[PDB]
Amino acid sequence: SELVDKLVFDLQSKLDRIISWGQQAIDLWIGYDRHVHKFIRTAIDMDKN
Amino acid sequence: MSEYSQTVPELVSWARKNDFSISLPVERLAFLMAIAVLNSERLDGEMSEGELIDAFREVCKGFEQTAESVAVRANNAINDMVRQKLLNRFTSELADGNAIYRLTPLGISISDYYIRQREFSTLRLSMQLSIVANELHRAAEAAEEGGDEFHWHRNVFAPLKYSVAEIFDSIDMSQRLMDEQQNFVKEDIAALLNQDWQAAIANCEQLLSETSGTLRELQDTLEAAGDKLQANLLRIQDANMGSGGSELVDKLVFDLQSKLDRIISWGQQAIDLWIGYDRHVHKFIRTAID
Amino acid sequence: MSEYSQTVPELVSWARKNDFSISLPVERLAFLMAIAVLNSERLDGEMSEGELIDAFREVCKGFEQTAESVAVRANNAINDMVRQKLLNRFTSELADGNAIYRLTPLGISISDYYIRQREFSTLRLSMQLSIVANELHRAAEAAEEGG
Amino acid sequence: TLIPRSVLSELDMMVGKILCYLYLSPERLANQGIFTSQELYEELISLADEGKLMKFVNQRSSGSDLDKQKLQEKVRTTLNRLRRLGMVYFLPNNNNKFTITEAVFRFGADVRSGDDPREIQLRMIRDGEAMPV
């Protein structure tokens, strides 16, 4: 049934999008987290007097 | 605690403090819809700045607008959508400064209202009523089995709050869609009567009867399922009262009963309004024929 | 059939022809949210014109606006909300000439986005995944049963 | 004065104070003084208010890439002006990299003494070192 095949294909495409979004969000958050930690370490520790 | 914790004066003060506003003229709304369509055709649900600019160019072409400053206009439109909370922008150092865009829940809700052809379906309602009946029956069985606060939170409160409440909201939305469809039929009856009223009497009677039949079928489906749903909500309420009584489960069951009463009352009120219009159109036809 | 049956050029031509637009300044948006809160507290999900004018009066007080011509401004706001497809107006002879108003799916989606405190819940997601897993499993068993 | 006098732009000051912090930074001393325009830009956006600073490039900026590239090009231009003033030297064969000099410390004239900022500013304007805007 072309109607069921198309509907199943659409749901599979939505599921792939839902799974892919989480990994992408984690990568973006990691980039920011690393940057904030680097910034804090630079601000705190490198001035010594 | 009421889903809407803020009184009207607190809410108006909050809205004024945050300066929330939506300004979507025909060109901006068309662009939002074009973005929503382009996003739905993609595998990653993400759009780059260049792709958004290409989409804006196609809208400007459809509006026969000057190709001058299109890149600037597209940037102003993109910034306006971000500023109006329709788009989320992600600026990663890892992406060499290239911003990634995703539509917000608001931008998707507005674009879907115009692009998604939502038709009232008795089959959709019957399916939603079948799923909610099964979910309410499982929650009622779990409530009657008894247990600790963790059993009640995971097997009674979570299904009522994150499944039954959402399906009731979906049914309510379908009823609001039916309200819009009735207003569309009213405009069509007024138009048929303004063009050729003598040739429109048969068509108007058919539209009136078909709309009446659909509203009755819907109300019959809601009344037949509504009692079983009310019985399961009462079973949960009795079980809660017997096992100490969580005020949170009681408030949630009361909210669901109130929503269910609104859903059942809407069908009767829609039928009464439709009966009033039907009589008015027949009176108008009689007066015009006389 | 793609949920969106129309290509981008067809959609743009269609939107241009129907002249669809949304204009909700801060006051009109606050009026919409006020209507949504008032409707959620009610048993019938319906609002009368007098109740809408009172809701608008409460918004005007919040914007520190003069009480002069509030009824005219309220009627214009109500007509604008109906024109923008945010409110459905029902005029029944049976309601003694009084118009009934109900929020449209668009008016509910816009008002809920700002007023409903939507927070991400792992429990909500786990429940949704459990329901879809059972629904997909039943649909797969039905597809394998044939018919 | 017999010779005319002029003042630097606020963007020049932002780039000046950032070049000053870069000179001091022991974390980057390993580069042997060689810095890249991208590193300067990254440090600047790390410290100052990005979206509010964008107001100077264009009154309508809201984070668009075209506007971000415009900001980078203005930075590239002002940095070239600072080179003529002798505050920074480009590499002999590569123009994307450059070296700092101690002359940049004049951008710290408002904070080298741990005292009331207002009084410092008054003292500076009295000495002819700096003007307001």
Numbering used by the authors:
A (entry chain C): 246 to 294
B (entry chain D): 1 to 290
C (entry chain C): 1 to 147
D (entry chain E): 81 to 213
What does the paper say about this structure?
MukBEF folds the chromosome of Escherichia coli and related bacteria. The heads are bridged by the kleisin MukF, whereby the C-terminal winged-helix domain (cWHD) of MukF binds the ‘‘cap’’ surface of one MukB, and the N-terminal middle domain (MD) binds the coiled-coil ‘‘neck’’ of the other MukB.
In addition to a sample under ATP turnover conditions, we collected datasets where sodium vanadate or beryllium fluoride had been added 1 h after reaction start. All three conditions enabled the reconstruction of a state with engaged heads, and we pooled the datasets to increase the signal and obtain higher resolution (STAR Methods). The resolved state was free of DNA, and the neck gate had opened widely. ATP binding and head engagement had triggered the detachment of the MukF MD from the MukB neck, which resulted in a swing-out of the MD of about 180°. Detachment of the MD was facilitated by the mechanical distortion of the MukB neck constrained between engaged heads and aligned arms, while the MD swing-out was stabilized by the binding of MukE to the top surface of the heads. ATP binding induces engagement of the heads within a MukBEF monomer, enabling ATP hydrolysis and subsequent head disengagement.
